[PDB]
Each structure stands twice: as structure tokens, then as C-alpha cells.
């Protein structure tokens, strides 16, 4: 089931986020950091291990896609590229983002960061580096994700997803 | 009042949104692999850019104005204190930096006269 | 508990935890510290001869947590689920 950003209608001032990865505990902690504070708009969090997403007739709009990647394991990579085949190209227009964890510890980074940099640059998608283990870094990434959600969801008048993509674009 | 008209217009644009949603849904979504993803995404992005450019090219009562004005004066009065406090903090910061600059200038001065007199003494000796 | 979060694939999580609990059990597993399998099986991908050693200060617990951590499949292979059952610690496998 290929996911589409333009399937249904969203709720009244409602925003949704999707997190796809392997480490369930890290996803739960990241969602806890997400919902530590709530803005004016209500927020829904979805966590999944792989794509295509399980079928559900009651699925609301998923306005943001975030893939967590650990440089500690190639298994998370293979998961990401296998899951990437179950989403349309329209999500790639600023509705998709990549968050790499553990990049600071160069000794613990199994795969080289050049690989994920090339992967992100190939699809022209934003790339973010953070460490979920550290509480401060996790919190900072928490307001970062909340506010990028606010930008992409259309809550603030003036910009869209393609606008922020042209903002967050890398030179090469 | 104006609120009822705003609600009616909101319902109208909700109807327009539903119309657009059911209009767009009759398209095969997409399918891309690694090799041809880049060109496809570039084409989709340029199409969306042209569409939104064309769309943007196509594009009350006194009580609400008064209430919003009162709100904005309250916001300005309640947030100017941060910028002021920054203004003092930078004032004393610049004063301290200026004093340090005169200190360094003074020290390098006698450094210069000492170096010049040493150079002249060595030149005269040889 | 924080109903705003809507976990997806929850059926997979509830199936894997149930299978792990049924295979291992609530009781504290016996404190076993060393395992070693000597295998010789056909490649199917001249048999390949493999030799693995599992070292752990507390086995049967990290193995218990592999499935919840998602490292292994929900049903573990019989070569690891019968350590207290078969009363066997060293194995040999042929094609």
C-alpha cells in the first residue's frame, strides 16, 4: 500500500508525524520528547518498523515523514531503502526528512556518513544530525521537529514544503 | 456579525477543499526506484513551482480591529523589555571591550618604542 | 498512557512479545554463561562448516530481549529455544 499525502482531510488544527525505524525504545523516547510540550495545534504521533504502513481505514492525514537511521547498523539502512519503495514521489517534495543518530561517535558509526549523505542528496531531502541518547540533544531535536512540522503543515502563512526544501537544500 | 460570515466562508472553502480532494484522487499515485528518482522529483518540483506561481499570480468591523490593536500594544509592551535588557548588556559589553582595546593599544605602544629603539641601537652599533 | 501517540504495527509488537513470553516464561531463566554450536550444512545460496560461540554473563536473558529489541524474528530458531528443554549446550548441525 503506497502512502499518499493527499488521501484524506486533516482535523481542525491537527498535525501528524510518522517515525519509521528499527529501535522501538528510541522511537518511544523521541515521541515522549515530541509530546513533552504541546502547541496550539493538536499533535498525533505514529511509529512504525517498516513500509508499507499497515492498512487502516481510520488513518488521518500524515503530513510529515521522518526516517530515523542509525549509523551503528546496516540493518537500519536496508530497512530504510526497502521501506522507501512504498511511498509516492510527492512525499519527497519536502514531506520527508532523515535523522541520523550516533553520528558524533565516529568510532561507533558502522556505516560511513558519506553513504547516508549521498542517499539524502540523491533524493533531495533534508538531512539532520542528532543524538537521541543525550537528553539535551533529544530535546533540541524535539522543538526542531515540532517547528518543522508547524512549517510543513501549513499552519504558518507564507511558505510550503517545497519552500522549506529550497531553504534546507544542500549545495552538493 | 462578521464571525458568522467568516464561518460561512470557512465552510465554503472546506467544500472547495473537498472538491479538490476528490478531483485529485483519480490519479495513479506514483512509483520510483533509485535510478530514475532524481529526474522524476525534479520534474514534479518544477511542475509544482509553476502551478503555485500561477496560483499566486491569480491572487470587517471596528470592534475586531480595536481588540487586535489592544492585543498588539500589549504584546509590544510585554516584549520590549528583552530588547532593552540586551541593549544595556551590549552597552556595558562594548564599554569593557573598548577599555580592553585601550589597554592593548597602550601596551603595544611602549612595545613599539622599545622595538624601534632596539633596532636603532643595533643599527648604530654595527 | 499518552493516547496522542498512535503506535502502528502494534499487532507485530503484541505478537512478538507474546511469542517471547510463551517461549521463555515469567520465571527467571537459569543462569547459563557459555554456549557453542558446531555446524556443517550445505550453502544453498561441499557444505559450509560453521562454528559459533555465545558468551554472556547472563544468557537466556539477552536472547530473551533479542525479539523485543527487534534483532531477531519473533519465533526464535529451535537451536536457541530448547537450551533448557533439550538439556543440551553444545550442538552439531549437518545438512
Amino acid at each position: 500500500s503506497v502512502l499518499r499525502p493527499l488521501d484524506k482531510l486533516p482535523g481542525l488544527n491537527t498535525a501528524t508525524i510518522l517515525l519509521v525505524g528499527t529501535e522501538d525504545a528510541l522511537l518511544q523516547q523521541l515521541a515522549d520528547s515530541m509530546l513533552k510540550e504541546d502547541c496550539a495545534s493538536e499533535l498525533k504521533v505514529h511509529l512504525a518498523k517498516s513500509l508499507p504502513l499497515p492498512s487502516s481505514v481510520n488513518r488521518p492525514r500524515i503530513d510529515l515523514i521522518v526516517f530515523v537511521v542509525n549509523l551503528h547498523s546496516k540493518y537500519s539502512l536496508q530497512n530504510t531503502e526497502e521501506s522507501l519503495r512504498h511511498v509516492d514521489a510527492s512525499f519527497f517534495l519536502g514531506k520527508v526528512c532523515f535523522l541520523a543518530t550516533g553520528a558524533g561517535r565516529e568510532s561507533h558509526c558502522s556505516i560511513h556518513r558519506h553513504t547516508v549523505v549521498k542517499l539524502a542528496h540523491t533524493y533531495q531531502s533534508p538531512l539532520l544530525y542528532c543524538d537521541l541518547e543525550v537528553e539535551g540533544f533529544r530535546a533540541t531535536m524535539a522543538q526542531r521537529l515540532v517547528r518543522v512540522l508547524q512549517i510543513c503543515a501549513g499552519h504558518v502563512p507564507g511558505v510550503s514544503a517545497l519552500n522549506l526544501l529550497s531553504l534546507l537544500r544542500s549545495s552538493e | 456579525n462578521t464571525e458568522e460570515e467568516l464561518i460561512r466562508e470557512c465552510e465554503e472553502m472546506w467544500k472547495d477543499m473537498e472538491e479538490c480532494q476528490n478531483k485529485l484522487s483519480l490519479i495513479g499515485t506514483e512509483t520510483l526506484t533509485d535510478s530514475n528518482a532524481q529526474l522524476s522529483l525534479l520534474i514534479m518540483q518544477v511542475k509544482c513551482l509553476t502551478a503555485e506561481l500561477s496560483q499566486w499570480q491569480k491572487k470587517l468591523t471596528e470592534d475586531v480591529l480595536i481588540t487586535l490593536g489592544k492585543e498588539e500594544f500589549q504584546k509590544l509592551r510585554q516584549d520590549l523589555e528583552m530588547v532593552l535588557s540586551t541593549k544595556e548588556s551590549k552597552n556595558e559589553k562594548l564599554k569593557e571591550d573598548l577599555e580592553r582595546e585601550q589597554r592593548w593599544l597602550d601596551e603595544q605602544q611602549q612595545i613599539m618604542e622599545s622595538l624601534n629603539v632596539l633596532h636603532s641601537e643595533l643599527k648604530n652599533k654595527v | 498512557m499518552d493516547s496522542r501517540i498512535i503506535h502502528e504495527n502494534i499487532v507485530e509488537k503484541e505478537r512478538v512479545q507474546r511469542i517471547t513470553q510463551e517461549t521463555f516464561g515469567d520465571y527467571p531463566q537459569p543462569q547459563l554463561e557459555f554456549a557453542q554450536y558446531k555446524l556443517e550444512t550445505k550453502f544453498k545460496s561441499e557444505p559450509l562448516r560453521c562454528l559459533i560461540k555465545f558468551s554472556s554473563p547472563h544468557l537466556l536473558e539477552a536472547l530473551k530481549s533479542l525479539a523485543p529489541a527487534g534483532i531477531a524474528d519473533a519465533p526464535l530458531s529451535p537451536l536457541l529455544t530448547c537450551i533448557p528443554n533439550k538439556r543440551m549446550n553444545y550442538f552439531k548441525i549437518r545438512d
Binding site: 482535523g11 481542525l12 488544527n13 493538536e42 481510520n58 | 465552510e11 472546506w14 | 550444512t41 519465533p75 530458531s77 529451535p78 537451536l79 548441525i93 549437518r94 545438512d95
Partner: peptide, 29 residues
């Protein structure tokens, strides 16, 4: 049809709520 609540119903709700295969490996080895 879980009665798609009308916008009006959902709106008031939010406003009000601001107070709360086990046989295939034993056959191969």
C-alpha cells in the same frame, strides 16, 4: 459509517476538552 462527525461537532469537542512456520526449520537440519 462511524458517523463522520460534522466539523461543528468536532470543533466544539476540542474547545470543550482544553481541560484533560514453526515446522520448516525442524525439517531442514
Amino acid at each position: 459509517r462511524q458517523a463522520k462527525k460534522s466539523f461543528s461537532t468536532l470543533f466544539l469537542e476540542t474547545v470543550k476538552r482544553k481541560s484533560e512456520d514453526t515446522k520448516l526449520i525442524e525439517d531442514e537440519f
